[PDB]
Design a protein around this ligand. Structure first.
Ligand SMILES: O=C(CCc1ccc(O)cc1)c1c(O)cc(O)cc1O
Ligand SMILES: O=C(CCc1ccc(O)cc1)c1c(O)cc(O)cc1O
Ligand SMILES: O=C(CCc1ccc(O)cc1)c1c(O)cc(O)cc1O
Lengths: 205, 206
C-alpha cells in the first residue's frame, strides 16, 4: 500500500538536505540512505543512480508554473504575454517565499558541479534548458501573432535574452538577497525583462 | 622580487585551472595541483594557503584584460562613459569565445565550483566580487546619465543589476550550450540588447 511509494518522496527530501549541506559532487547514495533511514536498495528501487535524484530535484521545479506555462504556449489564449507576466511573478514569488524552491535552486546553481565523471548532470541540464528555450519561443510567437509584441521580432534571440536575464537575476538573488528586494518589487523586475523583449530594436530583425 | 618564484607562482595557477577543469573545485586537493604543476607541495603553501586563495586568483586574473575600459567607463571626466561600456562588453564576449583560458576559468567559476557552508571562503569571495563589479556598473551608469546618454531618471542601482544579470546569464547559457548562441558572430546584437534594456525600459526608471 502506502509504504514503498511514500519512501520515494522521503528519499528526494533527504537528497535535498544532503545536497544542500555537502554538495552533489561529494554526496553519495550511501549518504542519502543514512539520512532517509533506508537502505541503498530502497533507493536503487526508485533511482538507478545519483543523476536521477538530481534530475528529480530539477523536474520538481516545473510543477507550480505548469499551467500558466502551458497557457502561454497555447495558440488559443488571448492573453499570452499576460500569462508570461503571471508566470514570471509566480517564479519570483515562489522563489522568495518557498524555502524548498529556494534550496533546490541554490543546489542547481551553486552546489552541483558539472564534472566528467558524472556528465549526465550536464547533459540533463543542457536538455532541460533547450526544452525551456523552445517553450519561451512559442510564447514569444503567440504574443506576436497577437499585437502584444512587435512583429517579426526575433523569437529565438528574444527567447535567449529573456532566459539569460531571468536565470541571471535568480542566481543573483541567490547570491545577494539583501541587495535585491525581489519580493517588494516583483512587478518592476519582471517588466524590466518584459520591456526588453518589446522595446529593444536589437532584438528585432 | 624574485624570478624563480614568479614562474613558480605562474606554474601553480595554470595547473589549478587545468585541475579544476577536469576534477572541479570540490574534489581537488592542493596536492593534486602539486604532481600536476611539478612544484614541490610546501611551495604551493608558501604561495597560497588553501583553495580560496587560489580560486580568488583565477577571478582576479579575468578582470585584467578589461582594466582600462572599465576604469575609463567609470571615470567622471570620460566624455563617453557609455562608449567605454559598449566596448568593454564587446571585449568581454570576444575574449570569452577566443581565449581558451578565459572560457575555462569561466567554466570553472560557473560550472565547477560548489558553495558549501564548509567552503565558506568561496562563497564569501564570490559575494564580494559581485558587489565590486556592481559598484563599477552603477558609477558608469551614473556617468552615462549625467552625460545625457541614458534616460534622465534612470535607476542606476537597479539598472546595474538588470544589466549584470543579463550578461552573467548570457555567458553561462553560452558556456552551457555554445552552439545555440553565436556569441561571436552576432556579438554586437547581444551587447546592444542589454544596453537597449538600460535605455528603453520604463521599469528601470526613478
Ligand atoms: O520565460 C519563461 C520562464 C523563464 C524562466 C526560465 C528558467 C527559470 O529558472 C526561471 C524562469 C516561460 C516559460 O518557461 C514557459 C512559458 O510557457 C512562458 C514563459 O514566459
Ligand atoms: O533548470 C533550471 C535551471 C537552468 C540552468 C541551470 C544551470 C545553469 O548554469 C544555467 C541555467 C530551471 C529552474 O531552476 C527553475 C525553473 O522554473 C525552470 C528551470 O528550467
Ligand atoms: O559590466 C561589466 C562587467 C560584466 C562582467 C564581466 C565579466 C564577467 O566574467 C562577468 C560579468 C562592467 C564592470 O564590471 C565595470 C565597469 O566599469 C563597466 C562594466 O561594463
Amino acid at each position: 500500500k502506502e509504504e514503498a511509494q511514500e519512501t520515494r518522496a522521503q528519499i528526494i527530501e533527504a537528497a535535498e538536505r544532503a545536497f544542500y549541506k555537502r554538495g552533489v559532487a561529494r554526496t553519495t547514495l550511501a549518504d542519502i540512505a543514512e539520512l532517509a533511514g533506508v537502505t541503498r536498495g530502497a533507493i536503487y528501487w526508485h533511482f538507478n543512480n545519483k543523476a536521477e535524484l538530481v534530475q528529480a530535484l530539477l523536474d520538481s521545479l516545473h510543477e507550480t508554473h505548469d499551467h500558466l506555462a502551458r497557457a502561454s504556449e497555447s495558440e488559443d489564449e488571448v492573453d499570452p504575454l499576460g500569462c508570461m507576466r503571471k508566470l514570471l511573478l509566480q517564479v519570483f514569488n515562489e522563489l522568495v517565499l518557498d524555502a524548498r524552491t529556494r534550496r533546490i535552486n541554490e543546489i542547481l546553481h551553486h552546489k552541483c558541479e558539472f564534472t566528467d565523471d558524472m556528465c549526465e548532470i550536464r547533459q540533463q541540464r543542457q536538455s532541460a534548458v533547450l526544452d525551456c528555450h523552445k517553450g519561451i519561443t512559442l510564447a514569444l510567437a503567440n504574443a506576436v501573432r497577437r499585437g502584444q509584441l512587435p512583429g517579426e521580432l526575433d523569437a529565438e534571440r528574444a527567447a535567449v535574452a529573456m532566459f539569460a536575464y531571468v536565470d541571471g537575476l535568480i542566481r543573483r538573488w541567490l547570491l545577494l538577497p539583501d541587495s535585491v528586494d525581489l519580493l517588494g518589487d516583483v512587478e518592476k523586475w519582471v517588466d524590466t525583462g518584459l520591456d526588453m523583449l518589446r522595446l529593444s530594436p536589437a532584438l528585432r530583425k
